[PDB]
A paper describes a structure:
As an integral membrane glycoprotein, HA forms homotrimeric spikes at the surface of the virion. The HA1 subunit contains a receptor-binding site (RBS) for binding of the virion to the cellular receptor sialic acid, whereas the HA2 subunit mediates the subsequent fusion between the viral envelope and the host's cellular endosomal membrane. The RBS consists of a number of conserved hydrophobic and aromatic residues at its base and three conserved elements, a 130-loop, 190-helix, and 220-loop at its edge.
Superimposing the two complexes onto the A/Anhui/1/2005 HA trimer demonstrated that the epitope of FLD21.140 on an HA monomer overlapped with that of AVFluIgG03, largely involving the RBS near the membrane-distal end of the trimeric spike. FLD21.140 covered a total surface of 753 Å2 on the globular head, of which 654 Å2 were by the heavy chain and 112 Å2 were by the light chain. Similarly to several published antibodies such as AVFluIgG03 (34, 42–49), recognition by FLD21.140 is largely mediated by the HCDR3 region through direct insertion into the shallow receptor-binding pocket framed by the 130-loop, 190-helix, and 220-loop. Another hydrophobic residue, Pro-106, and the aromatic residue Tyr-107 of FLD21.140 interacted with HA residues Trp-153 and Leu-104 through hydrophobic and van der Waals interactions, respectively. The contact residues Val-135, Ser-137, Trp-153, and Leu-104 were also involved in the interaction with the sialoglycan receptor analog, suggesting that FLD21.140 and AVFluIgG03 exert their neutralizing activities through direct competition with the sialic acid receptor. In the context of FLD21.140 recognition of A/Thailand/1(KAN-1)/2004, the residue Leu-133a of the HA globular head mainly formed hydrophobic interactions with Leu-103 and Pro-106 of FLD21.140. Furthermore, the residue Lys-144 on the HA globular head of A/Thailand/1(KAN-1)/2004 formed a salt bridge and a hydrogen bond with Glu-101 and Asn-102 of FLD21.140 HCDR3, respectively.
Author numbering:
A (entry chain L): 3 to 214
B (entry chain A): 49 to 68, 74 to 258
C (entry chain H): 1 to 140, 145 to 226
Write the structure that this text describes.
Amino acid sequence: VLTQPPSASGTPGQRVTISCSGSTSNIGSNAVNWYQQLPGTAPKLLIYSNNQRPSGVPDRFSGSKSGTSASLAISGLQSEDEADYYCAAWDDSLSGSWVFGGGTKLTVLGQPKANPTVTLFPPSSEELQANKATLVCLISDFYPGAVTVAWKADGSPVKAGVETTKPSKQSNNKYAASSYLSLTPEQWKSHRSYSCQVTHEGSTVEKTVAPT
Amino acid sequence: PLILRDCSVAGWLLGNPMCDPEWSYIVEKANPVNDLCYPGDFNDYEELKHLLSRINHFEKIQIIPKSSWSSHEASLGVSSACPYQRKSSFFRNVVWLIKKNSTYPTIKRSYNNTNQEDLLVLWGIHHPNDAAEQTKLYQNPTTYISVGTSTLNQRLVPRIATRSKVNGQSGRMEFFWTILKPNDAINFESNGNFIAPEYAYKIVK
Amino acid sequence: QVQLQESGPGLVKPSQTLSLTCTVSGGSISSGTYYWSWIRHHPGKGLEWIGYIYHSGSAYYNPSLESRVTMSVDTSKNQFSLKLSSVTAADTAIYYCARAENLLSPYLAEGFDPWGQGTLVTVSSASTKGPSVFPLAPSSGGTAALGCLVKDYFPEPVTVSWNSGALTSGVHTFPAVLQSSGLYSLSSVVTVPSSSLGTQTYICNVNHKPSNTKVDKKVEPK
Ligand SMILES: *[C@@H]1O[C@H](CO)[C@@H](O)[C@H](O)[C@H]1NC(C)=O
Ligand SMILES: *[C@@H]1O[C@H](CO)[C@@H](O)[C@H](O)[C@H]1NC(C)=O
């Protein structure tokens, strides 16, 4: 209902501004609030009454409004400010309600590279005893958030029965993903080994497991 | 002995929160900085100013406790137009009554002046900006305020209409006063938009 | 510090009624001039205010939801609650309770603070399904990774802890994958000293509240 840029970015120390465009019925007539949502948490209040900060919100966050538009300025940008920022206002239309902007994902660029730890697990005895077989490729603590996963049986590649999550932002601004390869117990026992190959940045790592 | 101020007589008698006992006359700024925090009008203002001359003995007393409203909300009647210490407030000697549990029952209150001094009693009416505002505050769409003493008769109706914004508010409050004589009673009846007395003033001339 | 806690996550069948409760602690729901609010986040969209309610009963709702929404207050339990009727998949969301702290007018309150941790409500006709849990055994004077695989549950979320919460260093619980079957699976892994493998016990604790399933699994070498 309120319009925000879907993304914004800055490098540490910079000032970044996040805009919120409304109408006469909402921003034009009523106080604006801003909310910050860090990854994994509920939104928290950042700005109320257009430009007031609650206790524990530093001066670097500055709210302003003019006409039917509002703006949030974040000075001295820090890596911990990566979050979704939401504007909100009362809207007078149709007897009234709170409305929110769509949110702006703020990324802080220039963070230090970290290559992923790749762990590959074979199917457990218990799962094999239940007549199923899953290989589990765990990929954690990498930055930035793009990875490629490929699987192999012996030396030949395998595409069928693979499920891979989208890279997800941890609390420490690094990323996690996983990939699952479903096999019959028989395919697991028929081959010499299976492999998970993860490429991130310009590095490729291959892990291998074999029936014991 | 005179009384000088940087507020209006209206804002001082109503208890405007932005504003913090015997005198010959009152002289007030033409344009005080603290008049009516919630915008509106004060009826028969000059007549009241002239009456408050050469007054002896002036004491505020509680005549209708804010806590005596059992079926209306007395705690919601605040506004960002009337800030006190960065939080929304309201004139302190009258009560902006609100519906309670989505209901606004008809009010029928009387106060008999059982003192021996004259009492200056103040009350008001709220003119909302639109019909949706009227539902949100009072529930009842069509409302009245009836006031009666032995010398006075009011049968008021709020005007629901959009005005230009003043202190953020496009609605209006209008205030009235009377001198209640000892052993006379003032009678109020309302189903909405009533700004009720809480504190009144003893007057000796 | 007032604190808010929504009731547990769950499944609701289409056209039924979603019911949630928020428990307030550290202060009285009837103390102060606050409004008690519900706000939801539909997956991959934004934030939508549902409404809020005063302790003595009056409430204000979002007009797009008004006809299906009712809220109530229970001052003796220090709780307030939300009923959303005739639900569809459009009502799948994380539901947050929150306190609107700053009155600007008799019915307009701003500054949602604090918020609860949300609660995920999934609207679906499919049946709830508890997970199967399998150990991911470490295979090794350094460090070893061990974990547990949480297979085939519905709906989200599950939570995983290790040794009842006593073990937090090195714990990574990964986001779930959504299988083409419509079931979720996830993994949790912890990194520990290789030396302690013979002497220390590692148990992962899997909780799936939508089905009332609690499963512990010992993860041991080989
Ligand atoms: C408020 O009104 C509802 C009807 O919507 C009624 O059921 C309830 O008893 C009332 N609450 C109180 C505290 O009187
Ligand atoms: C006020 O109270 C006195 C004493 O009880 C009574 O005599 C008088 O008639 C009352 N006045 C009115 C207007 O009811």
